[PDB]
Design an enzyme around this catalytic site. Structure first.
Site, PDB file in Angstrom:
ATOM      1  CG  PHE A   1      -8.220 -12.179  -4.029  1.00  0.00           C
ATOM      2  CD1 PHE A   1      -9.132 -11.483  -3.275  1.00  0.00           C
ATOM      3  CD2 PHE A   1      -7.398 -11.468  -4.894  1.00  0.00           C
ATOM      4  CE1 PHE A   1      -9.252 -10.115  -3.388  1.00  0.00           C
ATOM      5  CE2 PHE A   1      -7.519 -10.081  -5.002  1.00  0.00           C
ATOM      6  CZ  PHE A   1      -8.438  -9.422  -4.241  1.00  0.00           C
TER       7      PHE A   1
ATOM      8  CG  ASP B   1      -5.173   2.065  -0.204  1.00  0.00           C
ATOM      9  OD1 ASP B   1      -6.196   2.048   0.542  1.00  0.00           O
ATOM     10  OD2 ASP B   1      -4.931   1.093  -0.968  1.00  0.00           O
TER      11      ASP B   1
ATOM     12  CG  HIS C   1      -1.910  -1.234   1.186  1.00  0.00           C
ATOM     13  ND1 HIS C   1      -1.746  -2.310   2.040  1.00  0.00           N
ATOM     14  CD2 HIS C   1      -3.044  -1.491   0.486  1.00  0.00           C
ATOM     15  CE1 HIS C   1      -2.703  -3.198   1.829  1.00  0.00           C
ATOM     16  NE2 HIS C   1      -3.502  -2.727   0.888  1.00  0.00           N
TER      17      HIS C   1
ATOM     18  CG  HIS D   1      -2.227  -0.018  -4.428  1.00  0.00           C
ATOM     19  ND1 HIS D   1      -2.745  -1.246  -4.759  1.00  0.00           N
ATOM     20  CD2 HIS D   1      -3.257   0.711  -3.927  1.00  0.00           C
ATOM     21  CE1 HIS D   1      -4.033  -1.261  -4.454  1.00  0.00           C
ATOM     22  NE2 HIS D   1      -4.371  -0.085  -3.950  1.00  0.00           N
TER      23      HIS D   1
END
Ligand SMILES: Nc1ncnc2c1ncn2[C@@H]1O[C@H](COP(=O)(O)O)[C@@H](O)[C@H]1O
Ligand SMILES: [Mg+2]
Ligand SMILES: [Zn+2]
Length: 323
Positions: free
Chosen positions: A284, A113, A72, A76
């Site tokens: 996922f 983020d 993060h 990203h």
């Protein structure tokens, strides 16, 4: 330089390699790509955003993502913004969004983020963290990401939206908040269910272009577009997807370490001694990413059939890597 320019030829494409642009931009991928995206869309001229003011805001914003977090970090953010930029161009959405809405979705992606600490909402809630206390356990990180991003716009040298009207600042702010809060994974299911409903009642022109009646419909699509961009790594080329996988698994495993030290209950998928990186990706893809992208594919068909084929191929590669 010559290498960065060559890579940016793929700015409007899904195959763009953000790690390469990071290597060639003094490790400031977010600033680089945001500037490239904004020039590409004439957003600076349209919103009378000064070039200096925009760069200073973007560099400060990038600086507030943590470089010692595996996933993060500003890479990203930069990835989600670039992918949101490609999604906004899908032929099925042509001319559907105002330039303010386009401006909001890319800005949301960039800040979405910011200041991420490398641990989940649950962890912050179970360790009685200051963030969880501030935010009453509800979308803890997401509220915070919005708070930091909108806080940096308060100083004069950094306020990129100053030349928007009051009405435009207001409408953008409402849309941005809506978008980052939609990246909170505890809302995924309600978001996915609401998106399926919107496909059922899908209406188009002769041109195969979506018809969205009001604001409610347009922001529902932007909400979902940003969320898909955030869960877009398994849809990118395999070599890129595997770099993203190693980065998130590293971050999840460091969280399992922090949990074991504190004597807390170890979350199974964050457990480096028991979890399979290979099963984690299949699950996922099968339960989260595929159902989402399948629905998005239906909304914009057949614009996203390539992304869906790649996703299926990547899923099968991970499955074959399990004995
Ligand atoms: N490659 C992946 N493997 C497992 N989960 C993922 C992966 N990529 C994204 N996610 C999940 O999706 C969430 C997206 O939100 P964020 O991590 O805040 O960017 C992550 O927190 C993960 O839970
Ligand atoms: Mg997030
Ligand atoms: Zn994210």
């Amino acid at each position: 330089e010559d290498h960065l320019a060559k890579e940016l030829e793929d700015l409007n494409k899904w195959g763009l390699n953000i790690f390469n642009v990071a290597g060639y931009s003094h490790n400031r991928p977010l600033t680089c790509i945001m500037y490239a995206i904004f020039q590409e869309r004439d957003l600076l001229k349209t919103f009378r955003i000064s070039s200096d003011t925009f760069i200073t805001y973007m560099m400060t914003l990038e600086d507030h993502y943590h470089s010692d977090v595996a996933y993060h970090n500003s890479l990203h953010a930069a990835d989600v913004a670039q992918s949101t930029h490609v999604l906004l161009s899908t032929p099925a959405l042509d001319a559907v969004f105002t330039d303010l809405e386009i401006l909001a979705a890319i800005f949301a992606a960039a800040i979405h983020d910011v200041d991420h600490p490398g641990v989940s909402n649950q962890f912050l809630i179970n360790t009685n963290s200051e963030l969880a206390l501030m935010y009453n356990d509800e979308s803890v990180l997401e509220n915070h990401h919005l708070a930091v991003g909108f806080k940096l716009l308060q100083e004069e040298h950094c306020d990129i939206f100053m030349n928007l009207t009051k009405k435009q600042r207001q409408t953008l702010r409402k849309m941005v908040i809506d978008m980052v809060l939609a990246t909170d994974m505890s809302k995924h299911m309600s978001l996915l269910a609401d998106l399926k409903t919107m496909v059922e009642t899908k209406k188009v022109t002769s041109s195969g272009v979506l018809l969205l009646d009001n604001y409610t419909d347009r922001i529902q699509v932007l909400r979902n577009m940003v969320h898909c961009a955030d869960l877009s790594n398994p849809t990118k080329s395999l070599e890129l997807y595997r770099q993203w996988t190693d980065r998130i698994m590293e971050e999840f495993f460091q969280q399992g370490d922090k949990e074991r030290e504190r004597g807390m209950e170890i979350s199974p998928m964050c457990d480096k001694h028991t979890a399979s990186v290979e099963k984690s990706q299949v699950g996922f893809i099968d339960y989260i990413v595929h159902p989402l992208w399948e629905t998005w594919a239906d909304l914009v068909q057949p614009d996203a059939q390539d992304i869906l084929d790649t996703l299926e191929d990547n899923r099968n590669w991970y499955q074959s890597m399990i004995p």
